[PDB]
């Protein structure tokens, strides 16, 4: 009876567990999670208006309800239980704890009220408890987001969508309340490089172009000579560039020009600009603008980089969101860690020089893939682990699993959240959603959550 543990209950932890249980009929898989609830970025990252993307929770739930899987929420690995205790109790341990650290801008003014990471703002509208008191001031009229990836489009979309259109999503009631009073009417999404280097994808870009009540602001000068350079591009990429290109250059028909003219909100893309400093208001109490360094591109293909021209542009705004990526954080002394790439060093999921220790998801490869990318990568880890298990490369004989761990947690005063405990809060969140017309109304206060979890 192989005993395996998974650290982190996001898509990498759950897909790793699903592979292990599907391909080994006897193994037991225990999933540990620091938050009081499961699912990681599917609950706290994916936007409220992309409920379709969160449907993977139904298959994760079937895995967690199975006889050979168990969930242990409210357990911070590296703090409440160490990795070495886990290594001693299980045949294999898989690190799947994501990339919790936002990359900072590292620029002067970053401390002014009105500056936030995009993930923190997302965590605020998606109910991550640690961001419940973010209280972003939306009394300004313009927001600037740095970074042109899908996370940037999500934050811009939420700031500009007519609030009534978010009423039936699972967005927190607190954030929708704040959005109803927001004075933000313009959002600029700024990149250091040019149109060919954008990182967003077509579904999200189209949602922005078609967002009711808004008009797009693209400068045709940023697109001169584009069709020519995209003739040899991959199909999906070329389609994305053609949609941007049309949006920037085609003159709209009569009805669309009228719709654009009556729009009360607008969004735009700015290129060749890198963040130099956040500018304060006269009294220093808040952000009032962003000073950008003009840039030009050098290099070819993926090797292209932005270099400064010496010119600068000041762009007035009251909210600055940095959407420039993430890094994993070290977790425990027994686990090697590369501060440069912000990943646990590994060879196809086997942690360097640590027999029995593996990794999957963002902590294995870096923070760049979508959920499907995380799923197929976790299956790769699951294959190597099971081959190591079948071949007798892991310790032979028993291994206690949770019987050992719980006896340690019992003594330390840590009471883990089981999946059946989570089911109680889930039912409560869903029922509270019935009155208002939402999928659920998330509980945000950890104390109240613990009560509703039966703790
Ligand atoms: C803002 C945002 C929006 C996104 N939107 C989409 C989208 O629309 N579509 C899409 O396909 N992908 C989206 N993604 C990408 C998707 O979120 C990632 O592909 C996926 O969640 C990465 O999975 P993961 O399991 O590695 O990490 P995560 O999902 O982060 O999960 C890691 C888990 O480990 C837990 N953990 C951390 N530390 C510990 C510890 N010490 N002990 C125990 N547990 C711990 C975390 O709490 C968490 O639950 C988005 C990402 C972000 C940031
Ligand atoms: N629907 C979906 O499929 C979906 C939805 C949401 C999120 N996700 C995913 O989740 C992952 C995380 O996304 P993300 O938006 O944070 O990152 P991302 O997709 O990698 O884009 C972030 C970046 O910010 C820029 N950048 C980095 N440092 C900068 C600096 N100091 N100043 C200015 N710009 C800087 C980089 O652009 P440059 O290198 O040219 O400058 C890069 O584009 C992505 O892989 C995203 O696709 C997917």
């Amino acid at each position: 009876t192989p005993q395996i543990c998974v650290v982190g209950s996001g898509p990498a932890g759950f897909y790793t567990a699903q592979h292990l249980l599907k391909h080994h009929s006897r193994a037991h898989v225990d999933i540990y999670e620091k938050q009081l609830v499961p699912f990681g970025l599917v609950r706290f990252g994916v936007a409220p208006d992309h409920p379709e993307v969160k449907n993977v929770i139904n298959t994760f739930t079937q895995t967690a309800r199975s006889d050979r899987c168990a969930f242990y929420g409210n357990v911070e690995v590296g703090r409440d239980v160490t990795v070495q205790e886990l290594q001693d109790a299980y045949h294999a341990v898989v690190l799947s704890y994501g990339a919790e650290d936002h990359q900072a801008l590292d620029i002067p003014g970053e401390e002014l009220p009105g500056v936030f990471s995009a993930r923190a703002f997302v965590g605020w509208y998606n109910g991550l408890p640690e961001n419940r008191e973010l209280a972003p001031d939306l009394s300004c009229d313009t927001a600037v987001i740095l970074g042109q990836g899908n996370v940037a489009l999500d934050v811009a979309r939420i700031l500009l969508t007519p609030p009534d259109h978010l009423e039936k999503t699972d967005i927190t009631e607190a954030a929708l309340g704040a959005l109803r009073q927001s004075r933000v009417k313009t959002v600029w999404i700024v990149g250091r490089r040019g149109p060919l280097q954008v990182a967003f994808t077509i579904k999200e870009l189209r949602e922005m172009i078609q967002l009711p009540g808004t008009r797009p602001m693209l400068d045709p000068a940023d697109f001169l000579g584009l069709q020519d350079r995209i003739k040899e591009a991959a199909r999906p990429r070329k389609r994305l560039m053609e949609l941007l290109l049309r949006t920037a250059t085609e003159k709209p028909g009569v009805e669309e020009a009228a719709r654009r003219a009556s729009a009360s909100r607008a969004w735009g893309l700015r290129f060749f600009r890198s963040p130099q400093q956040v500018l304060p208001s006269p009294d220093g109490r808040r952000a009032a603008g962003i000073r950008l360094a003009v840039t030009r591109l050098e290099g070819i293909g993926e090797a292209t980089r932005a270099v400064p021209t010496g010119d600068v542009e000041d762009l007035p705004c009251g909210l600055v969101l940095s959407s420039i990526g993430y890094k994993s954080r070290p977790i425990d002394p027994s686990v090697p860690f590369d501060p440069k790439l912000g990943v646990v060093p590994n060879m196809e999921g086997r942690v360097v020089d640590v027999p029995g220790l593996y990794c999957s998801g963002w902590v294995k490869r870096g923070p760049t893939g979508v959920i499907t990318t995380t799923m197929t990568d976790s299956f790769l880890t699951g294959q190597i682990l099971l081959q190591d298990l079948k071949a007798g490369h892991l310790p032979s004989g028993p291994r206690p699993g949770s019987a050992f761990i719980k006896a340690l947690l019992d003594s330390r005063g840590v009471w883990p959240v089981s999946f059946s405990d989570w089911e109680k809060l889930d039912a409560e969140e869903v029922s509270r959603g019935q009155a208002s017309g939402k999928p659920r109304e998330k509980l945000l206060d950890p104390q109240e959550m613990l009560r509703l979890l039966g703790h």
Side-chain angles (χ1 to χ4, degrees):
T1 173
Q3 294 290 164
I4 301 166
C5 86
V6 157
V7 180
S9 73
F14 266 109
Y15 278 126
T16 299
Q18 180 194 287
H19 180 90
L20 302 168
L21 298 166
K22 166 175 186 162
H23 297 98
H24 190 120
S25 69
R26 299 293 253 41
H28 193 278
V29 179
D30 284 341
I31 301 170
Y32 290 87
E33 166 63 48
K34 165 158 110 146
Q35 295 297 320
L36 301 183
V37 301
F39 307 145
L41 289 168
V42 184
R43 176 178 172 95
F44 295 127
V46 177
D49 58 350
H50 281 167
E52 57 287 353
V53 180
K54 313 167 180 270
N55 281 329
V56 299
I57 286 171
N58 296 316
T59 200
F60 296 168
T61 294
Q62 294 296 123
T63 292
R65 283 176 183 163
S66 82
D67 294 358
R68 295 183 283 135
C69 187
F71 173 77
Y72 297 96
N74 199 25
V75 175
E76 181 171 341
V77 174
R79 190 195 63 196
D80 300 325
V81 60
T82 69
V83 173
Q84 190 63 63
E85 288 161 342
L86 297 178
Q87 289 170 275
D88 290 346
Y90 287 92
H91 288 103
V93 173
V94 186
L95 299 177
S96 301
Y97 69 84
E100 220 167 359
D101 264 287
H102 72 263
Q103 287 272 30
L105 255 1
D106 288 331
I107 67 177
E110 201 174 2
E111 78 281 353
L112 288 160
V115 184
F116 299 99
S117 65
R119 215 218 269 194
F121 184 86
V122 170
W124 164 78
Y125 65 63
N126 281 338
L128 182 60
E130 74 205 69
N131 297 130
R132 72 184 180 279
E133 297 296 321
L134 194 72
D137 186 349
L138 310 180
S139 65
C140 56
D141 61 34
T142 296
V144 166
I145 301 170
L146 306 153
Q148 295 175 320
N150 285 329
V151 176
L153 293 185
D154 277 359
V155 170
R157 193 175 65 251
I158 296 301
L159 282 163
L160 298 179
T161 288
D164 289 351
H165 302 197
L166 266 11
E167 267 172 18
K168 290 193 143 306
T169 68
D170 70 359
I171 186 167
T172 65
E173 53 167 357
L176 180 59
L179 290 167
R180 289 192 157 107
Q181 307 298 323
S182 170
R183 295 188 56 265
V184 180
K185 290 180 190 315
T186 301
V187 178
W188 295 101
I189 311 181
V190 185
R192 297 184 297 187
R193 301 183 291 163
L196 289 158
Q197 291 76 42
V198 302
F200 53 62
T201 48
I202 202 159
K203 175 184 163 204
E204 306 78 7
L205 171 65
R206 195 185 305 281
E207 257 184 329
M208 207 66 217
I209 298 173
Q210 310 211 237
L211 192 63
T214 72
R215 57 183 171 96
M217 304 182 289
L218 302 177
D219 185 346
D222 292 336
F223 298 86
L224 119 155
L226 179 63
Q227 187 79 62
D228 264 71
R229 196 142 68 185
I230 69 174
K231 86 212 316 190
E232 300 286 36
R235 298 281 302 282
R237 195 67 172 161
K238 179 187 262 203
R239 191 178 175 227
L240 175 73
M241 303 287 112
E242 288 175 343
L243 169 62
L244 272 180
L245 215 224
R246 268 190 293 292
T247 303
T249 64
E250 296 188 358
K251 181 256 207 78
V254 185
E255 295 157 284
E256 175 72 12
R259 188 192 78 68
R260 285 184 185 187
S262 58
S264 69
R265 297 181 181 181
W267 60 280
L269 266 12
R270 304 289 322 276
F271 293 105
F272 315 111
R273 294 283 183 287
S274 65
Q276 179 169 299
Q277 169 183 3
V278 184
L279 308 165
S281 55
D283 68 3
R285 301 209 69 138
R286 59 198 280 199
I290 185 152
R291 177 160 295 155
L292 304 162
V294 179
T295 75
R296 50 180 182 84
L297 308 175
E298 297 187 341
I300 313 177
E302 311 292 350
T304 72
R305 324 323 268 169
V307 297
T309 67
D311 293 349
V312 298
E313 177 184 350
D314 290 349
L315 180 61
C317 62
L319 190 75
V320 179
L321 306 178
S322 45
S323 189
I324 65 169
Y326 318 102
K327 280 197 166 182
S328 292
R329 194 186 281 185
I331 188 174
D332 179 294
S334 146
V335 179
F337 178 73
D338 177 351
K340 182 139 202 180
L341 293 170
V343 302
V344 173
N346 65 99
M347 191 328 89
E348 293 298 318
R350 291 205 192 105
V351 178
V352 178
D353 289 334
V354 188
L357 189 61
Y358 295 79
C359 52
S360 66
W362 278 17
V363 73
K364 177 182 172 187
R365 302 283 194 197
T368 58
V370 290
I371 295 168
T372 53
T373 286
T374 300
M375 179 175 74
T376 58
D377 169 63
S378 306
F379 294 164
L380 288 183
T381 289
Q383 285 180 71
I384 289 172
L385 193 161
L386 289 186
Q387 176 61 65
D388 294 341
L389 183 175
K390 156 169 178 169
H393 299 94
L394 306 173
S396 199
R399 299 271 147 150
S402 60
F404 175 71
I405 297 310
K406 284 180 215 214
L408 285 182
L409 296 169
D410 276 348
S411 298
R412 279 161 198 180
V414 173
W415 180 5
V417 166
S418 66
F419 202 78
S420 64
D421 291 339
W422 150 247
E423 299 257 31
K424 176 191 285 184
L425 175 62
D426 181 52
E428 186 61 20
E429 296 183 337
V430 174
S431 290
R432 288 182 178 199
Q434 289 291 296
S436 46
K438 301 174 66 171
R440 61 184 63 235
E441 186 67 59
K442 296 177 178 170
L443 269 295
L444 302 195
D445 174 43
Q447 245 41 60
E448 188 172 13
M449 305 171 48
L450 279 161
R451 277 136 55 192
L452 289 173
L453 285 173
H455 291 216

